[PDB]
Amino acid sequence: HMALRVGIVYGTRPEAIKLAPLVLALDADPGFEPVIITTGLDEINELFGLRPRHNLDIMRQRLSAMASRIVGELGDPLLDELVDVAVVQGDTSTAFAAAYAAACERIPVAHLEAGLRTGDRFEPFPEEINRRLITQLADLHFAPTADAAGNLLAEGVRSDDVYVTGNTVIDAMHLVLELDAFTEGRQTVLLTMHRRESWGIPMGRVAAAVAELCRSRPTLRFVIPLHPNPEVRRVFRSHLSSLTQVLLCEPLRYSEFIRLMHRAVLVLTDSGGVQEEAPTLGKPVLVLRDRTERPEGIAAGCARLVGTDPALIVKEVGRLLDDPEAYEAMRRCYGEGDAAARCLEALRERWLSSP
Amino acid sequence: HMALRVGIVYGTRPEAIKLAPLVLALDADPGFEPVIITTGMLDEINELFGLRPRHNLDIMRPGQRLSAMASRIVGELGDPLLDELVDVAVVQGDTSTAFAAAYAAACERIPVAHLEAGLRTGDRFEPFPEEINRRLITQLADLHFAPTADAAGNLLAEGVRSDDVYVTGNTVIDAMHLVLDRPGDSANRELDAFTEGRQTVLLTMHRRESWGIPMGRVAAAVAELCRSRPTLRFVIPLHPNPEVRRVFRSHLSSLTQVLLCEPLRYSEFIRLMHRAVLVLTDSGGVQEEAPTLGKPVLVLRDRTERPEGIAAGCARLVGTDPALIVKEVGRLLDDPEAYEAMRRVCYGEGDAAARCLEALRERWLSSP
Amino acid sequence: HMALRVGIVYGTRPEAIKLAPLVLALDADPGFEPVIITTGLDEINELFGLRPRHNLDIMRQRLSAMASRIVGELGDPLLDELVDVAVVQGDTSTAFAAAYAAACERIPVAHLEAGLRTGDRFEPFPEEINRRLITQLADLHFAPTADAAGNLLAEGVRSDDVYVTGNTVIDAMHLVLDNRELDAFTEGRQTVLLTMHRRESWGIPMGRVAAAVAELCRSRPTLRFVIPLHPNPEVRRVFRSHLSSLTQVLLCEPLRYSEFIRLMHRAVLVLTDSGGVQEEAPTLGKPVLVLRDRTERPEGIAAGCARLVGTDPALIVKEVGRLLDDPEAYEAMRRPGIVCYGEGDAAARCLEALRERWLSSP
Amino acid sequence: HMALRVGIVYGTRPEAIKLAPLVLALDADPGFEPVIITTGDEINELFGLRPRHNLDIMRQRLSAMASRIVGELGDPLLDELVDVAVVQGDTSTAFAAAYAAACERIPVAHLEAGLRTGDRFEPFPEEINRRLITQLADLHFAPTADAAGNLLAEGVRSDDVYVTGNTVIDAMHLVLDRELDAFTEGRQTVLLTMHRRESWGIPMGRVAAAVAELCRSRPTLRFVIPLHPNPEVRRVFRSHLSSLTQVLLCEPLRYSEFIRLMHRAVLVLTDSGGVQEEAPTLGKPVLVLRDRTERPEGIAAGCARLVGTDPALIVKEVGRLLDDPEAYEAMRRPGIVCYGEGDAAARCLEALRERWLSSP
Ligand SMILES: O=c1ccn([C@@H]2O[C@H](COP(=O)(O)OP(=O)(O)O)[C@@H](O)[C@H]2O)c(=O)[nH]1
Ligand SMILES: O=c1ccn([C@@H]2O[C@H](COP(=O)(O)OP(=O)(O)O)[C@@H](O)[C@H]2O)c(=O)[nH]1
Ligand SMILES: O=c1ccn([C@@H]2O[C@H](COP(=O)(O)OP(=O)(O)O)[C@@H](O)[C@H]2O)c(=O)[nH]1
Ligand SMILES: O=c1ccn([C@@H]2O[C@H](COP(=O)(O)OP(=O)(O)O)[C@@H](O)[C@H]2O)c(=O)[nH]1
Ligand code: NA
Ligand code: NA
Ligand code: NA
Ligand code: NA
């Protein structure tokens, strides 16, 4: 019996984690077959049982060269694997270039995690322009919130093409629910920082803030899983590697990482995923950015913008550690953890029905 | 002294004609320098308007996949844009060049302006890829030169800030005016001989979705009208594709009432449109040009991105139904009341190049 | 003003000579534009004013590699030049591969010099199979004789697709009838013209023909031979090694078409395995002895203009002697009233066929 | 008679200007033949430089560029029968070309040798390039005694170091032999050039802000700003200053036009290495738009002052020089010569002749 062959295209850990619940749902349901094509991970592929049919070796590079290669070369594997529908996730240059490649072969596109907007043009670049381009290419939009759905309507998308499914990152969290020795019976702050526009001086300022807090509060601990880039590792290592209050880590497997987030007293991050995951475990989030495409957590008081100002990070972390009223004010946004299923029903409704 | 270096990227006759007025204005004004980069019939238009390309990427050929073409423009346009020290890039219309070039410009953080912005059919991926290209260019462009208020509205509906939209009108009107004051370059011996003191219908048809059977139906309609009306003449400049030429040639080449032509130089073509009693076309350009010369237009399509001419009664949808084409052409030839009902500016005054310049100056040649 | 863009594809001197009249006619008539694409000549291009738009550098080689490249690469130039119709000539692997390439792009094909058959399968190879393949690909067939038209009908071609136009090689002859040393050598002597090039005759059989020229030369001191040599070092060596000492023989480089037709006009008779020369020589009333065991030109055989002689030296000697001694046998091989292969207006008749087929509506 | 075939390798305007005097001297003297190989036309035409080969390598990752020059420059050096190669300055070309020459056992001379900031990999890769070229070169043409000292400190034998001065002074003299005049005529004109990559974005914005404040405060003051050919540099200046008719933003100027303008300027703001050498030689005070320089000679002699990208300090420092004629004359003090007399090409030739056209 005919399965809808659903192309799944990603290049990065974040995309893979958010797409994994949808791949698993597509694999479980007999009406669909997931066909994974990567542009890049093996740790996450193993954890969720993702088996790529093809790996283009494109990402290492100028944005134009990367986009050129994906547009040029993704058509063939999509045609060879007899893909009926392609799903791309998020704001990546892969999601955009893959969606354009799909459109060139008249393969309909669905967009997982659609409608997030900062409101500031080409800020960040190229993520903000990618979302707006994918938005025009996609036939179907899986919005994580009503706010996100509104942003799509404002860019001319028909209401019938938008499903508020919530975020699959919540599904993924639920599927995974020396580090213990280090955290056991201590107040532990979890920090991740990776955004390219923060590399160098601004990361130094955040590392300085962690240092000031550490000396001021001998019982305080930090765990910092480092983004796999030698420039990011060097700024943190050169600022914090001597302080035994800080445990610098290699990237953690998603299970180990979500477990650690569960034990943390609060979370400092510029991650989009962590901004969605941490509030769901009732951990206050201080966002190491000047803007966010996740204003829901800001408005609800789950999360506060803090940027890369060391004085403000120190103040804000202290406030939450000392004053339990301010702490509880940031605990009670992004879906129930059944988003994969709601995506499937949207796909079934759109491409597995007749009038 | 520092000039705003304005990149001008096109691949096709239609783009070149619409961009020519803007290139000329940029060349005349000392504050700007036009830098033409082509991705490509064109040398004729380049010569007529004095366009001198700085670079010609040899990317577009007849039998190429859309993905391969887009891939090459995205891959290769960056370097010439950087080497020529381009500050701002202008793309025109709905072409896959305009989209791929705009994306390439954006990758190098070169701001983009879109000439002829906001035209919409309202039907998704219809036609493909023109409708999706417009929507993609719309998100890439910092500045939008809309030809009408209707077009400006369509941009607002896709989330564009009002301050980024100028209603400049269509540069195709500028271009028309620049070739109507040029009778020597417009003189065509055999065309004049064929039309002089005869009722002449002008027909152009080129849209890919109409190739084969539908063009055959339109050629059948021209045949029926010709035999029924011995004094009636048709001039049909053929799109340079052998499959388009074969359908018209095989249906009409024996009728001496029909003159099948090679593509005509823009001057010769506008002159002919001026002498025509009415126009049958699926062309976007001709739908803008013909009403401006007070020629009724029958549009050989099921939809248009140009509803202004429909609403004003300048133009009527006719599709590729031979019965309806015959009826509609007859109506206009016999009944002078129906004819005058399709004549009276829908698409601007012919000063759009200048209005574009003032938008560029305002946006990228001013400081707080 | 709409011109039918007519692709002209060739790789060799023989194709170029036969296509030149058609190119000239297409250039003269305003309804058509010739678009030449070569797979290779400069001498012939200059003589007839042929100006190639593209030169693919394909022919120098295994048949499969050559065909593969033409099939692979000729489509693009045909599309770029906006060709409406492609013309190929004769039995060459270029004519076949080009016709297939044209057909892949849905470009209709016309075949110049269509329907010649030996009647023996894959003999010669690949010429005989090329003709039969081109025959199925072509929409339009310019047959040079009624016999050739019949052969096309027998392979299932519709009568309406066959025009008996005659051979353009006769047009080409007339266009060059409008050399110091050659005249000096022939002046007041009985001169035999010999050309031999067929690959299946290389080595021993050419040696036998060169032996026959030697025997005839020693036996008949007043007899002269002019032998323009095919441009291949193996062909040049067999003739040079057998005849370079005999001052009765003038071995030549390939001659410009004008010089060659002039020489054929002065010759008393012609020995050849050439298809072109078998068409040209009878038209100048020169008896032809064909250095082959078969011909695709049986019209000259039937009319007595030409006789099969093969590569048997005894028979060549006998047959050349017969014609030189006995003026009754000589006149029996001249029919200067009758034309086997057309009147020299074939280019025009091809144009009217193209106009009728692709520049009219029902 | 045998000419020493001297390879001349460059990829950029700055290298070409500094190498031009040496090429001309090599062309004039019959004992030498210059063989130009570029890795990159106005400058070539102006000085009559005729490249024998143009590798099309520079447009890109540093590793890919270096890899290509190391890989491919050997052949043209061998084909042109080069005996000795000269590289100039701190460019990745000068380094990769010098390494390529060394692989073919072609001796290397370094034009403009020994300039040091003293701060490691700052800037990158210029500072490491100088130290690598320094170990590859057999012969070092130092522009000052300070520079010669830096070479001795990195283990170079004293006999391999000639203090020749800077060829940029020669080049200036070779070009001192309409709208710009109209704009400057009878006005106090500041010349500003700024191009260093580490200053792109915010810091350039701060410098453009300083030009704006000075302009509004001093209606008679004029600025001419020839813009580095990069669209990000052009945008920051255009977006800050294009409305102020006291500022004339320019395209890159031909070397002659540029030196003429510098001659008419009252003072010079720059992060350029070349301009820091040229402007003092025309007695124009220089405010250096950087936090460090490889040219401390002008700092020490008072010809030039570090100013960085702080708008308050640029405003103060430009004002000081415009108002107080004592501070102005303190930055022209005739007597000390920081970067040579303009005869450096000749002194280079005598070093080449001495080293590779003599026998014991
Ligand atoms: O050591 C780590 C750090 C992060 N994450 C996961 O990585 C995702 C997002 O990290 P990223 O670097 O992608 O930031 P983003 O691109 O989402 O802004 C989230 O799902 C995290 O739970 C992880 O598994 N291990
Ligand atoms: O023989 C012709 C036919 C049309 N045009 C012009 O071509 C443009 C329209 O181009 P086309 O119809 O090929 O494309 P479209 O405009 O439909 O996108 C208009 O300005 C016409 O006046 C021309 O110059 N010569
Ligand atoms: O030295 C020569 C020999 C032949 N031909 C001409 O070449 C053509 C035939 O060439 P070939 O015999 O190689 O080809 P074939 O006719 O056997 O296919 C005929 O038109 C001859 O008139 C020529 O111009 N010069
Ligand atoms: O518009 C200009 C700007 C600079 N220069 C010259 O360029 C050289 C310095 O260029 P740049 O500042 O880019 O290089 P740097 O010296 O910092 O390497 C000097 O000799 C200047 O005279 C020029 O001719 N025109
Ligand atoms: Na399944
Ligand atoms: Na101008
Ligand atoms: Na002609
Ligand atoms: Na010399």
Author numbering:
A (entry chain C): 0 to 39, 45 to 64, 67 to 183, 193 to 347, 352 to 374
B (entry chain A): 0 to 39, 44 to 347, 351 to 374
C (entry chain B): 0 to 39, 45 to 64, 67 to 184, 191 to 374
D (entry chain E): 0 to 39, 46 to 64, 67 to 184, 192 to 374
What did the published study say regarding this structure?
Here we report a structural and functional analysis for an epimerase, KasQ, that primes KSM biosynthesis rather than the previously proposed KasF/H, which instead acts as an acetyltransferase, inactivating KSM. Our biochemical and biophysical analysis determined that KasQ converts UDP-GlcNAc to UDP-ManNAc as the initial step in the biosynthetic pathway. To better understand the catalytic mechanism of KasQ, we solved crystal structures of KasQ for the wild type (WT) and its complexes with UDP or UDP-Glc in resolutions of 2.44 Å, 2.58 Å, and 2.09 Å, respectively. In brief, each monomer consists of two domains (N-terminal and C-terminal domains), in which each subdomain is made of a typical sandwich (αβα) architecture of a Rossmann fold.
As revealed above, UDP or UDP-Glc is bound to its binding site at the interface of the two domains. The superimposition of KasQ–UDP and KasQ–UDP-Glc with an RMSD of 0.29 Å for 332 Cα atoms suggested no apparent conformational differences as a result of binding from different ligands. The electron density of UDP or UDP-Glc is well defined and consistent in the substrate binding site. The UDP binding site is highly conserved among all non-hydrolyzing UDP-GlcNAc 2-epimerases: the guanidino side chain of Arg12 and the backbone of Leu267 are in close contact with the uracil O2 atom, likely due to hydrogen bonding (3.1 Å and 3.4 Å, respectively). The backbone of Leu267 is also in a hydrogen-bonding distance to the O4 atom (3.1 Å) and the N3 atom (2.7 Å) of the uracil base. The two hydroxyl groups of the ribose moiety are associated with Glu292 (2.8 Å and 2.6 Å) by hydrogen bonds. His209 may play a role in stabilizing UDP by interacting with its α-phosphate (3.1 Å) and β-phosphate (2.6 Å). Ser286, Gly287, and Gly289 are three highly conserved residues for molecular recognition, in which Ser286 interacts with α/β phosphate (2.7 Å/3.2 Å, respectively), Gly287 is in contact with the O1/O2 atom of β-phosphate (3.3 Å/3.1 Å, respectively), and Gly289 is associated with the O1 atom of β-phosphate (2.9 Å). In the KasQ–UDP complex, the carboxyl group of Glu32 makes an additional interaction with the Na+ ion. Of these, the binding affinity of UDP versus KasQ was shown to be 2–5-fold higher than that of the others, suggesting that UDP-sugar is most likely the physiological substrate for KasQ.
